[PDB]
């Protein structure tokens, strides 16, 4: 009974990074080594664990977080990183245990004239906590003067479209990202690597 990773990796549309999706996976066999050795993924980095170790471990739940960012932001999906994605959109803990997977999605997520569906948060009063998801849309007050519902000097809308076009340079092309995290509860540990099965 193989984990339905297809539903996450092969989804026709992905979330905007500010409104990132989380899929719970349970009651199945996960082959992390087959994922790791796949040529479909150009980024595959594990923290606190490796794919060989995950092949020999059982968890209660696995979470697959997924979203789209531009290529030059892929480096921000790691512990201890700064920049607008890590600070304001999607944050890993310093002590992260799990895997960051990414691939170029220019053929799916870019459009002639721009794909404006994908957004990210450009501004926030403080940094996100790990695994926090902020979908708020209030004017960002960049200075001491209240905005009172009006955009202008130091009063900005907090979300920005990417507008992916196929001709973008690779740093500005869309990348699909999946982050795997692992949960152990006092409950049956029903997500297992093939060795612990």
């Amino acid at each position, epitope marked *: 009974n193989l984990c339905p990773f297809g539903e996450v990796f092969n989804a026709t549309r992905f979330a905007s990074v500010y409104a990132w999706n989380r899929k719970r996976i349970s009651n199945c066999v996960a082959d992390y080594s087959v994922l*790791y*050795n796949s*040529a479909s993924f*150009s*980024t*595959f*980095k*594990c*923290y606190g*664990v*490796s*794919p*060989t170790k995950l092949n020999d471990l059982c968890f209660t739940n696995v979470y697959a977080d997924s979203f789209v960012i531009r*290529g*030059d932001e*892929v*480096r921000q999906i*790691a512990p201890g990183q700064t920049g607008k994605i890590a600070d304001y959109n999607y944050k890993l803990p310093d002590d992260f245990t799990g*895997c960051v997977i990414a691939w170029n999605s220019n053929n799916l997520d870019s459009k002639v004239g721009g794909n404006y569906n994908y957004l990210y948060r450009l501004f926030r009063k403080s940094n996100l906590k790990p695994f926090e998801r902020d979908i708020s849309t209030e004017i960002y007050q960049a200075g001491s003067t209240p905005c009172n519902g009006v955009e202008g000097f130091n009063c900005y809308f907090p979300l920005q479209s990417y507008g992916f076009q196929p001709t973008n340079g690779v740093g500005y092309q869309p990348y699909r990202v999946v982050v795997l995290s692992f949960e152990l509860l006092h409950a049956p540990a029903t997500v297992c690597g093939p060795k612990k099965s």
Partner: nanobody
Amino acid sequence: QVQLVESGGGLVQPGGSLRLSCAASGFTNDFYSIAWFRQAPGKEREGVSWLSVSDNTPTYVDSVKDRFTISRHNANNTVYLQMNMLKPEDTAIYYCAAGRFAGRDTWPSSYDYWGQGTQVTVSS
């Protein structure tokens, strides 16, 4: 603290072989991975081979698959890239890079530790 020492480059004829070496010092433990990035004339740095050290898993791009072998010798904490059946296309400055993760990335910006390059030239 962490340092990568690169060597092994030179001039070879098309068809020749070369053995690049990356010596990693200031790591506590085996939980890092190495990448080899080549920078051809007028191109950006591009990944060609990865080694996840703790798992000992190699990865190669398709264009070097059967010609290039990456490996590690435990004793001297050194990762080797054996480059066989070299073509003129393989001419570039080769960099090794390290990150505190198990795996691989095509983005140079994802690697915080870099050797000084070694020049590889393949012509007649």
